[PDB]
Design a protein around this motif. Structure first.
Motif, PDB file in Angstrom:
ATOM      1  N   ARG A  59      32.128  41.799  37.791  1.00 12.29           N
ATOM      2  CA  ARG A  59      31.804  40.826  37.169  1.00 12.29           C
ATOM      3  C   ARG A  59      31.377  39.515  37.781  1.00 12.29           C
ATOM      4  O   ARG A  59      30.700  38.614  37.376  1.00 12.29           O
ATOM      5  CB  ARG A  59      33.420  40.055  36.393  1.00 12.29           C
ATOM      6  CG  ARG A  59      33.073  39.150  35.576  1.00 12.29           C
ATOM      7  CD  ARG A  59      34.434  38.554  34.752  1.00 12.29           C
ATOM      8  NE  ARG A  59      34.702  39.718  33.674  1.00 12.29           N
ATOM      9  CZ  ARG A  59      33.969  39.715  32.562  1.00 12.29           C
ATOM     10  NH1 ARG A  59      33.170  38.836  32.102  1.00 12.29           N
ATOM     11  NH2 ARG A  59      33.981  40.958  31.727  1.00 12.29           N
ATOM     12  N   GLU A  75      28.456  43.808  27.469  1.00 10.87           N
ATOM     13  CA  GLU A  75      29.083  42.442  27.354  1.00 10.87           C
ATOM     14  C   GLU A  75      27.895  41.349  27.334  1.00 10.87           C
ATOM     15  O   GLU A  75      27.165  41.379  28.201  1.00 10.87           O
ATOM     16  CB  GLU A  75      30.117  42.155  28.213  1.00 10.87           C
ATOM     17  CG  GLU A  75      30.886  40.763  28.036  1.00 10.87           C
ATOM     18  CD  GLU A  75      31.979  40.498  29.067  1.00 10.87           C
ATOM     19  OE1 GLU A  75      32.631  41.402  29.618  1.00 10.87           O
ATOM     20  OE2 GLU A  75      32.043  39.137  29.558  1.00 10.87           O
ATOM     21  N   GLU A 110      28.590  49.174  25.165  1.00  8.84           N
ATOM     22  CA  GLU A 110      29.767  48.325  25.476  1.00  8.84           C
ATOM     23  C   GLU A 110      29.155  47.082  26.472  1.00  8.84           C
ATOM     24  O   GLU A 110      30.109  46.553  27.030  1.00  8.84           O
ATOM     25  CB  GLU A 110      30.541  49.062  26.344  1.00  8.84           C
ATOM     26  CG  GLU A 110      31.372  49.989  25.631  1.00  8.84           C
ATOM     27  CD  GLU A 110      32.420  51.153  26.330  1.00  8.84           C
ATOM     28  OE1 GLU A 110      32.490  50.762  27.569  1.00  8.84           O
ATOM     29  OE2 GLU A 110      33.025  51.939  25.674  1.00  8.84           O
ATOM     30  N   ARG A 166      30.314  47.374  30.473  1.00  2.17           N
ATOM     31  CA  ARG A 166      31.406  46.424  30.941  1.00  2.17           C
ATOM     32  C   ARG A 166      31.479  46.274  32.315  1.00  2.17           C
ATOM     33  O   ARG A 166      31.407  47.119  33.407  1.00  2.17           O
ATOM     34  CB  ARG A 166      32.843  46.708  30.319  1.00  2.17           C
ATOM     35  CG  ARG A 166      32.972  47.282  28.939  1.00  2.17           C
ATOM     36  CD  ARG A 166      34.754  47.836  28.934  1.00  2.17           C
ATOM     37  NE  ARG A 166      34.774  48.232  27.355  1.00  2.17           N
ATOM     38  CZ  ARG A 166      35.897  48.836  27.010  1.00  2.17           C
ATOM     39  NH1 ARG A 166      36.559  49.486  28.197  1.00  2.17           N
ATOM     40  NH2 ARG A 166      36.106  49.100  25.897  1.00  2.17           N
TER      41      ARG A 166
END
Length: 124
Positions: A42, A122, A120, A35
């Motif tokens: 991000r 994404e 996990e 993640r």
């Protein structure tokens, strides 16, 4: 090219990409898994995804052209594929700049793979 990406980061964020974003969280650096851990992470996740969608040219070695006008980075050239690479880098540079408020190298530098489980990961 990656050298240009480093240049845009220094121009926009006024920081060295190599020193501050080459091994931060799960996605800042080559590849990634797990993640995105925070805002900065991000930004990198999105950048990886952006490069992954470029077809017709090479985000790593191809050179694009840009200019600075109206206080921004303007991607140009006569090649739409190269302009797309430039947009990916431009967006990431701005993202790093806009999230300096939460940048935390003490917690996220060399985060570790265990903390970024493949299960996990994404999807883009």
């Amino acid at each position: 090219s990656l050298v240009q990406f480093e240049t845009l980061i220094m121009k926009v964020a006024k920081k060295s990409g190599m020193q501050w974003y080459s091994n931060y969280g799960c996605y800042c650096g080559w590849g990634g898994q797990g993640r995105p851990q925070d805002a900065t992470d991000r930004c990198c996740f999105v950048h990886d995804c952006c490069y992954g969608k470029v077809t017709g040219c090479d985000p790593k070695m191809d050179v694009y052209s840009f200019s600075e006008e109206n206080g921004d980075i303007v991607c140009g050239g006569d090649d739409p594929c190269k302009k797309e690479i430039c947009e990916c880098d431009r967006a990431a540079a701005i993202c790093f700049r806009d999230n300096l408020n939460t940048y935390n190298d003490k917690k996220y530098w060399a985060f570790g793979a265990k903390n970024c489980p493949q299960e996990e990961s994404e999807p883009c």
